[PDB]
């Protein structure tokens, strides 16, 4: 546990999907060893805004890391804000009386730990502001943000954005996992799948089956052969368009090419991006038309 150098790279890999389910996929073929349904945890992003159909705007966050914020309005397509969800929460409470209208940003961030049996996928015990219960198992953390923005005109937001993560002990290991110890090297790919390529010359080796939702979180698992622990570390990632889509609860989310180069390149150009017969107003009056319009890849400027 001091130098990632010593430690077996396990054949297990751990994936999180955008609907907030957790699966263990086998690093050698992309076989789905087991999944856990997201009733067991929390939705990864759930944005609750004042209304897409009256105003032609929607709030959108990239469900990754700090949870970066983006925004789309039918008048000027998709924009990236210089704000992060963690970062906003970390600067509450903020009251701003623009001069004109005033907002109030009140935050909330929780921490939780689960220990899960690898072999199987059963949650052995769950800790923290969550539900405190009591071999070859693994312990995984998950931070959960929740920004509430309270505008007095009434234009009332309420995003909640959760995100998995290693035990903050092991995080110095993560700076050592600079490229897969393995030759392999796996990423989210098209149609809710993982694709694994070789490192040398970027060539597809395996494709996984489908996951209930797009895979947005990825973990290598190492073995301390002395202490016999299952320490887990994020899978590294290889060296300005973003791809939009929505979760099942209908919240919009982004995947930047910075973070999801591999997916965003295999992704179709969004209709809105392509033809103005899709940027006309009638379109954003209807939910289904809207969805169809902006889903896919745009290119922020």
């Amino acid at each position: 546990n001091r130098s990632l150098n010593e430690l077996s790279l396990s054949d297990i890999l751990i994936a999180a999907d955008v609907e907030g389910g957790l699966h263990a996929v086998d690093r050698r073929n992309g076989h789905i060893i087991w999944s856990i349904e997201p009733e067991n945890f929390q939705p990864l992003i759930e944005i609750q805004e004042p209304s897409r159909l009256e105003t032609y705007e929607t709030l959108i966050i990239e469900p990754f890391g700090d949870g970066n914020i983006y925004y789309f309005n039918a008048h000027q397509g998709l924009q990236k804000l210089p704000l992060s969800i963690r970062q906003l929460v970390s600067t509450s409470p903020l009251h701003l009386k623009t001069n004109e209208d005033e907002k109030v940003y009140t935050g909330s961030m929780r921490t939780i730990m689960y220990t899960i049996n690898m072999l199987n996928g059963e949650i052995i015990s769950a800790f923290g502001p969550g539900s405190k219960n009591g071999e070859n198992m693994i312990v995984i953390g998950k931070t959960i943000f929740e920004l509430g923005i309270h505008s007095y005109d009434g234009a009332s937001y309420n995003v909640t954005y959760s995100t998995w993560q290693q035990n903050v002990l092991d995080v110095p290991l993560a700076l050592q996992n600079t490229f897969s110890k393995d030759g392999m090297c796996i990423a989210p790919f098209r149609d809710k799948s993982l694709l694994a390529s070789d490192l040398d010359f970027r060539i597809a080796r395996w494709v996984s089956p489908t996951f209930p939702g797009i895979i947005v979180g990825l973990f290598d698992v190492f073995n301390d052969l002395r202490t016999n622990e299952n320490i887990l570390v994020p899978h590294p990632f290889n060296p300005n368009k973003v791809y939009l889509d929505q979760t099942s609860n209908l919240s919009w989310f982004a995947l930047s090419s910075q973070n999801f180069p591999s997916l965003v390149e295999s992704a179709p150009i969004s209709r809105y991006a392509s033809s103005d017969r899709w940027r006309v107003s009638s379109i954003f009056e209807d939910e289904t038309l809207f969805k169809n319009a902006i889903m896919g890849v745009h290119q922020i400027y």
Binding site: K181, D182, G183, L199, D200, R202, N238, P239
Partner: peptide
Amino acid sequence: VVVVVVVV
């Protein structure tokens, strides 16, 4: 393992 890695 001589694993080589994408150029700089």
